Amino acid sequence: SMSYTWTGALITPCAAEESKLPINPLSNSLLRHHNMVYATTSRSASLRQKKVTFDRLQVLDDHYRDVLKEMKAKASTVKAKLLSIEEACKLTPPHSAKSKFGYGAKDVRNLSSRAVNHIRSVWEDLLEDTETPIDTTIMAKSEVFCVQPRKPARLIVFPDLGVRVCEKMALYDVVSTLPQAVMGSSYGFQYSPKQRVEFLVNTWKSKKCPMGFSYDTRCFDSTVTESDIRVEESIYQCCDLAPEARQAIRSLTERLYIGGPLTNSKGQNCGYRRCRASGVLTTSCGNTLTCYLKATAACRAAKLQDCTMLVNGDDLVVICESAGTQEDAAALRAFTEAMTRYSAPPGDPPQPEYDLELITSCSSNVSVAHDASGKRVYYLTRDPTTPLARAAWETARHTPINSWLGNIIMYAPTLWARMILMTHFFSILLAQEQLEKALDCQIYGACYSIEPLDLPQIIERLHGLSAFTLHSYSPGEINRVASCLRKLGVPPLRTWRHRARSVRAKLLSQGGRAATCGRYLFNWAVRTKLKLTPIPAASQLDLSGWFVAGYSGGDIYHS
Numbered sequence: 001s002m003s004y005t006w007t008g009a010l011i012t013p014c015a016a017e018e019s020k021l022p023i024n025p026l027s028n029s030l031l032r033h034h035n036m037v038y039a040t041t042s043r044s045a046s047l048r049q050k051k052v053t054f055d056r057l058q059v060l061d062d063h064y065r066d067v068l069k070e071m072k073a074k075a076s077t078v079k080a081k082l083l084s085i086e087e088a089c090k091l092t093p094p095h096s097a098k099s100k101f102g103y104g105a106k107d108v109r110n111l112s113s114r115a116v117n118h119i120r121s122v123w124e125d126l127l128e129d130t131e132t133p134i135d136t137t138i139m140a141k142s143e144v145f146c147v148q149p150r151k152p153a154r155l156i157v158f159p160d161l162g163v164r165v166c167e168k169m170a171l172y173d174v175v176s177t178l179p180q181a182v183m184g185s186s187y188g189f190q191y192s193p194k195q196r197v198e199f200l201v202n203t204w205k206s207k208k209c210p211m212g213f214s215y216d217t218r219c220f221d222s223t224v225t226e227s228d229i230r231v232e233e234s235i236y237q238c239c240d241l242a243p244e245a246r247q248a249i250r251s252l253t254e255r256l257y258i259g260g261p262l263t264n265s266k267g268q269n270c271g272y273r274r275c276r277a278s279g280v281l282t283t284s285c286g287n288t289l290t291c292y293l294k295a296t297a298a299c300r301a302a303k304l305q306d307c308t309m310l311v312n313g314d315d316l317v318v319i320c321e322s323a324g325t326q327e328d329a330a331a332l333r334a335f336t337e338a339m340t341r342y343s344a345p346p347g348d349p350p351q352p353e354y355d356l357e358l359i360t361s362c363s364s365n366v367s368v369a370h371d372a373s374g375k376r377v378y379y380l381t382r383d384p385t386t387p388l389a390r391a392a393w394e395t396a397r398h399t400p401i402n403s404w405l406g407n408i409i410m411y412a413p414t415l416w417a418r419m420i421l422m423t424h425f426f427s428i429l430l431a432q433e434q435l436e437k438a439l440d441c442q443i444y445g446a447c448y449s450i451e452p453l454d455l456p457q458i459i460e461r462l463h464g465l466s467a468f469t470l471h472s473y474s475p476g477e478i479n480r481v482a483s484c485l486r487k488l489g490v491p492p493l494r495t496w497r498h499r500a501r502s503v504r505a506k507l508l509s510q511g512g513r514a515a516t517c518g519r520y521l522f523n524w525a526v527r528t529k530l531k532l533t534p535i536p537a538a539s540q541l542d543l544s545g546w547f548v549a550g551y552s553g554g555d556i557y558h559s
């Protein structure tokens with residue numbers, strides 16, 4: 001069927017939309033070529049629509065039915081708990097889009113009688129009505145990027161806050177446990193950056209002659225069919241569920257997950273959806289399962305050898321036993337034809353790679369650096385263009401989410417995150433003393449409220465002391481960063497070193513934790529550097545739950 005149908009009404013914004021980076025003193029320090037940074041707006045929704053709208057082609061086969069059964073078999077071991085209204089409400093982000101029924105996120109978290117009564121009614125309605133499509137709002141997603149040698153905005157579709165709270169009750173436990181029980185080590189979100197690097201290396205070194213490739217599905221969401229969504233529910237249905245949880249999942253599947261009407265911000269009827277809605281709790285899990293299923297089956301159809309998959313929602317990387325240059329190009333092409341039949345056509349054609357560092361998955365790639373000792377240490381890095389553009393944007397304007405804080409946590413070991421991001425921001429934060437102001441950022445979709453003064457502990461727990469001494473990065477890595485700093489017009493190492501030394505000092509100076517920041521995060525700043533040792537408070541932080549499952553668009557907030 002058509003992934004989308006449109007009435008012709010427009011996808012509208014519910015407020016004004018900024019697209020250009022503002023001329024700002026504090027923002028010019030970091031990035032100079034401001035006219036290169038932009039934000040997507042609804043003004044380009046139509047371009048995205050034309051690209052996501054089309055009629056899906058899908059042909060299942062024995063390999064597909066076989067992998068599905070293997071997956072359903074493992075799903076059978078799971079027992080999922082029904083979440084209480086209180087626990088569900090406790091998972092709702094503080095600034096989640098309010099309900100159109102007279103209450104918002106604040107009330108939901110407070111457990112106010114009004115928000116709770118409505119959630120129950122929405123739940124009762126789920127147990128009783130198994131057909132009526134549930135309404136969803138469509139909006140153009142606002143994302144910053146850097147011009148290219150632009151990008152039309154991504155589309156987001158989500159239901160009312162009431163329903164979202166119900167999803168959590170019926171499915172939170174399922175989407176957080178199942179992926180893991182079904183795909184095992186292949187499930188990406190169970191890994192912190194370091195562990196992913198480790199899995200990618202151990203998987204790589206386990207083959208005699210490794211051959212890997214990343215696989216980019218063209219607008220994965222619009223490629224998800226009604227069959228895929230029922231196949232996905234068929235997997236959930238294998239869990240031991242509470243009766244109401246089972247009705248809720250059956251009803252959420254027919255009334256929301258497979259499709260439904262689309263309403264813009266103005267109340268108008270925009271059209272209909274018959275594919276994955278990016279804004280429901282099951283998006284991340286559903287996609288990870290679907291992508292894993294099609295890839296695992298496709299790998300058998302293409303005669304690829306020793307298929308080790310790594311899946312993160314729609315992002316997919318494959319590492320396997322090479323069979324020869326020619327043979328691998330043929331096997332890989334066969335793989336794409338298989339995925340195309342299962343309705344996962346390629347965006348950019350996959351390319352076999354024989355150098356791990358040359359593989360981009362989750363917009364990242366593994367790379368080598370050296371620590372104080374001089375021993376080789378692997379870390380996860382990525383082209384810094386987008387992280388930096390976004391940092392500039394987050395410096396010039398005020399935003400709910402702080403990607404820089406999230407990028408510093410996920411990429412603390414990188415040359416760019418420490419040199420630029422840490423220096424830039426800690427400098428700005430001190431100059432307004434807000435090192436204690438907790439900020440919100442995201443990790444695998446989930447929203448987190450993190451304190452900037454706790455970054456040393458976090459970096460040591462997640463990446464290890466080496467992250468503070470990495471040096472002698474790879475040739476490829478410095479080229480990228482160089483090329484990047486040249487492009488956006490960012491001041492050279494010389495300038496950052498100088499700014500860091502100034503931040504370090506004013507940090508060691510003022511106090512305790514802040515001094516810890518200066519001593520650890522900026523140890524690369526001084527020549528007569530202090531010998532770094534394990535930070536006590538580190539093993540005190542509850543990093544449980546940080547890397548268990550993906551929640552992109554799932555409206556989740558961990559406290």
Ligand SMILES: CC(C)N(c1cc(-c2ccccc2)sc1C(=O)O)C(=O)[C@H]1CC[C@H](C)CC1
Nearest residue numbers: 415418419470471472473478479481482493524
């Ligand atoms: C002087 C040199 C030893 N160096 C270095 C600069 C590179 C750089 C490359 C491209 C653009 C800007 C800087 S790479 C590279 C390295 O260690 O290989 C360093 O000391 C850095 C300084 C920044 C620290 C976050 C990590 C350590």
